[PDB]
Amino acid sequence: EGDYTQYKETSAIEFINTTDPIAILANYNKLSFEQPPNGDVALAALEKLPETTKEIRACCDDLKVLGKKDFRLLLKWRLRVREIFGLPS
């Protein structure tokens, strides 16, 4: 109840900062890089990083068509970015 239209999006930073990355991947449709109304500097940084390649942006656009290798690649890229950004682990 309440999740009509069966569609949900977040920002990429939320996927980076979350404690449960598996929950976001399994329950959302799109990881967006759209600059927030205010303007997120982390989005600007994460967009311009060389780790996020064309394949990474392809998977984030459509989460419901991904497979085993694609999901693992997203988790690996999350860990690499968190190391750059100084997150705990």
CB of 42 to other proteins, least distance (A): 27
Tokens representing residue 46 in the block: 């994460």
CA distance 19 to 31: 16
Of 48, 42, 52, whose CA–CA distance to 86 is shortest? Answer: 42
Is residue 5 involved in binding other proteins (CB under 8 A)? Answer: yes
CB of 10 to other proteins, least distance (A): 15
Strand ranges, E, within the chain: 9-11, 30-32
The region of 16-24, 31-39, 43-51, 64-72 touching other proteins under the rule CB under 8 A is: 64-72
Is residue 55 involved in binding other proteins (CB under 8 A)? Answer: yes
Residues that bind other proteins (CB under 8 A): 5-7, 29, 54-55, 58, 64-70
